[PDB]
Design a protein around this nucleic acid. Structure first.
Length: 151
DNA sequence: GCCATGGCTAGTA
DNA sequence: TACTAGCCATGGC
């Protein structure tokens, strides 16, 4: 049974949907998974220094159920890339499987139903360029700046 | 299944 | 820089 909850943040009211089974989707407005998520974020923003101490919630969304490239990607990304780090679309294609399929990672990230958590903002253009971003480019930038990046 | 698309890239003039 | 032509896993239809 899908449940939703809002929470203030530097990015604006973040609304987290999800049931007892796992986190469904982190959306930006401007049960056990929610209690962990609403703590992981509240941590990430206001106490990034220690984000490893917090539990990554169970992800329920229909994207994590059916096996695909997308799933491998989102996974192969959440695992590999951590706070302050960054990985190129191609560097992430190589990880999930097809090193040529960097482009399809775009929509993968576009489609990512759990931004921040699953760091989509850490995926940038190969040219070093920050790249575009689903919830509006300003965010991707504020986040990386947040994660100690120079701009 | 066929085809348009988009958050990619390396190359080229 | 500006622009182009492979490469690719999706989502409509």
């Amino acid at each position: 049974e899908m449940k939703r909850t809002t929470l203030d943040s530097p990015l604006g009211k973040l609304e987290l949907s999800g049931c007892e089974q796992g986190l469904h989707e982190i959306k930006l407005l401007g049960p056990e998974p929610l209690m962990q998520c609403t703590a992981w974020l509240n941590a990430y923003f206001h106490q990034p220094e220690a984000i490893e101490e917090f539990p990554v919630p169970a992800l329920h969304h229909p994207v994590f159920q059916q096996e695909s490239f997308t799933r491998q990607v989102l996974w192969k990304l959440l695992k590999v890339v951590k706070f302050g780090e960054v990985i190129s679309y191609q560097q992430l294609a190589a990880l999930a499987g097809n090193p040529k399929a960097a482009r399809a990672v775009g929509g993968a990230m576009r489609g990512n139903p759990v931004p921040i958590l699953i760091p989509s903002h850490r995926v940038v253009c190969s040219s070093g360029a920050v790249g575009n971003y689903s919830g509006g480019l300003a965010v991707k930038e504020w986040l990386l700046a947040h994660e100690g990046h120079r701009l």
